[PDB]
């Protein structure tokens, strides 16, 4: 809530362009959110 990186939480993309997610959460494009692989 108010997160970002974690279980179905959207993704906050850095200006370094990496996208924040704790392993092995990946966030995929579509959905914007760090989800299992």
Same mark, same amino acid.
Do not use: Q, Y
């Given at each position: 809530?108010? !997160?970002?990186? @974690?279980? @179905? !939480? /959207?993704?906050?993309? $850095?200006? @370094?362009?990496?996208? %924040?997610?704790?392993? /092995?959460? %990946?966030?995929?494009?579509? +959905? +914007? $959110?760090? !989800?299992? /692989?």
């Amino acid at each position: 809530d108010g !997160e970002c990186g @974690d279980k @179905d !939480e /959207p993704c906050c993309g $850095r200006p @370094d362009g990496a996208k %924040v997610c704790n392993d /092995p959460w %990946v966030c995929i494009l579509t +959905s +914007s $959110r760090c !989800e299992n /692989p």
